[PDB]
């Protein structure tokens, strides 16, 4: 059709080249309402009851590129039809400016600005504001029943865990049967449910409208490009089948289910781990290591195999430095997921 013009992944980072708003329904019924740079929405060609609202976006960072030709392709194949479509989606390729500039942001981490409180005007700050409107706008005479939010990602770095999910810890029941599901027929290897609030894109979904919302973190940060699809082909096939609505057709898998046991926020200056960059996500400890030293107080591991996440180095004495993390034994209560 003509909405495009070589692809929502590049007519989206395109900068000398502005890509105007233009409504258009296709073939099969499956109307496209092109919003503003990086913004397209979907909704059936039906539009019944029990339809879904998601919102799955992209780029939230710059580095991680592996989600932007999986959401690209998706979009290709909703227009040609190869894609059916069953659920009211809008598709999200914020901060296309640093995606383009190869780097994880410009001035800020942008996925740390959406909570109510405030924060210095930084470039990533103007897009959040924006984006805050994306999902007043889209969540509108919904029902949260029918809300869904997942933010894909890349991992900065390696993990004993290909992928993994990590849910919000929200005040409202975040967590379904439904959601949980999902996350096993893309076969995503490890969940970390958050122990307390953030500013995640996605964490600011379920507290602001209780849609099961996620973040998913597929892979590693490659290039784009690098990015081995291959390796997020049950991820690919899920999500199809997510806003197809239909037949879930291939086998899927349990993931191993982490609680976050606490984080790691840095707060001194003689700061140290016991590992350099080779540090894998999830790597546990015994009761009797320390994985580095404060100056002040050490740190070592509470538990026998309290694994550690998001080992970052770029910590400030404020941010926080990694994740704690148990492999706890879920079950289910009124299709809701709870531990223990």
Same mark, same amino acid.
């Given at each position: 059709?003509?909405?495009?013009?070589?692809?929502?992944?590049?007519? &989206?980072?395109?900068?000398?080249?502005?890509?105007?708003?233009?409504?258009?329904?296709?073939?099969?019924?499956?109307? =496209?309402?092109?919003?503003?740079? %990086? *913004?397209?929405? *979907?909704?059936?060609?039906?539009?019944?009851?029990?339809?879904?609202?998601?919102?799955? #976006?992209?780029?939230?960072?710059?580095?991680?590129?592996?989600?932007?030709?999986?959401?690209?392709?998706?979009?290709?194949?909703? +227009?040609?039809?190869?894609?059916? *479509?069953?659920?009211?989606?809008?598709?999200? /390729?914020?901060?296309?400016?640093?995606?383009?500039?190869? *780097?994880?942001?410009?001035?800020?981490? =942008?996925?740390?600005?959406?909570?109510?409180?405030?924060?210095?005007? #930084?470039?990533?700050?103007?897009? !959040?504001?924006?984006?805050?409107?994306?999902?007043?706008?889209?969540?509108?005479?919904?029902?949260?029943?029918?809300?869904?939010?997942?933010?894909?990602?890349?991992?900065?770095? %390696? &993990?004993?865990?290909?992928?993994?999910?990590?849910?919000?810890?929200?005040?409202?029941? +975040?967590?379904?049967?439904?959601?949980?599901?999902?996350?096993?027929?893309?076969? $995503?290897?490890?969940? /970390?449910?958050?122990?307390?609030?953030?500013?995640?894109? &996605?964490?600011?979904?379920?507290?602001?409208?209780?849609?099961?919302?996620?973040?998913?973190?597929? @892979?590693? +940060?490659?290039?784009?490009?690098?990015?081995?699809?291959?390796?997020?082909?049950?991820?690919?096939?899920?999500?199809?089948?997510?806003?197809?609505?239909?037949?879930?057709?291939?086998?899927?898998?349990? &993931?191993?289910?982490?609680?976050?046991?606490?984080? $790691?926020?840095?707060?001194?200056?003689?700061?140290?781990?016991?590992?350099?960059?080779?540090?894998?996500?999830?790597?546990?400890?015994?009761? @009797?290591?320390?994985? %580095?030293?404060?100056?002040?107080?050490?740190?070592? !591991?509470?538990?026998?195999?309290?694994?550690?996440?998001?080992?970052?180095?770029?910590?400030?004495? %404020?941010?926080?430095?990694?994740?704690?993390?148990?492999?706890?034994?879920?079950?289910?209560?009124?299709?809701?997921?709870?531990?223990?």
């Amino acid at each position: 059709k003509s909405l495009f013009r070589q692809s929502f992944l590049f007519d &989206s980072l395109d900068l000398d080249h502005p890509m105007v708003a233009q409504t258009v329904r296709t073939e099969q019924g499956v109307t =496209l309402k092109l919003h503003q740079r %990086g *913004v397209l929405e *979907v909704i059936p060609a039906q539009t019944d009851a029990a339809t879904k609202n998601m919102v799955i #976006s992209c780029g939230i960072h710059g580095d991680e590129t592996a989600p932007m030709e999986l959401l690209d392709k998706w979009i290709d194949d909703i +227009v040609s039809g190869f894609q059916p *479509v069953a659920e009211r989606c809008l598709f999200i /390729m914020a901060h296309p400016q640093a995606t383009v500039r190869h *780097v994880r942001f410009i001035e800020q981490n =942008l996925n740390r600005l959406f909570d109510d409180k405030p924060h210095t005007p #930084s470039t990533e700050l103007a897009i !959040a504001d924006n984006l805050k409107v994306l999902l007043r706008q889209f969540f509108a005479n919904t029902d949260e029943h029918s809300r869904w939010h997942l933010d894909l990602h890349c991992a900065i770095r %390696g &993990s004993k865990h290909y992928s993994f999910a990590v849910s919000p810890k929200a005040r409202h029941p +975040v967590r379904s049967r439904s959601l949980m599901q999902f996350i096993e027929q893309a076969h $995503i290897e490890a969940v /970390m449910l958050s122990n307390a609030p953030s500013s995640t894109f &996605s964490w600011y979904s379920a507290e602001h409208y209780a849609a099961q919302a996620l973040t998913l973190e597929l @892979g590693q +940060v490659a290039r784009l490009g690098e990015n081995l699809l291959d390796r997020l082909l049950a991820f690919d096939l899920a999500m199809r089948d997510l806003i197809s609505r239909h037949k879930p057709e291939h086998l899927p898998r349990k &993931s191993v289910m982490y609680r976050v046991s606490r984080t $790691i926020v840095r707060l001194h200056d003689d700061f140290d781990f016991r590992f350099s960059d080779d540090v894998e996500n999830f790597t546990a400890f015994m009761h @009797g290591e320390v994985f %580095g030293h404060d100056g002040d107080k050490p740190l070592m !591991a509470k538990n026998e195999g309290e694994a550690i996440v998001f080992p970052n180095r770029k910590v400030a004495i %404020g941010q926080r430095a990694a994740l704690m993390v148990c492999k706890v034994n879920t079950r289910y209560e009124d299709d809701q997921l709870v531990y223990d």
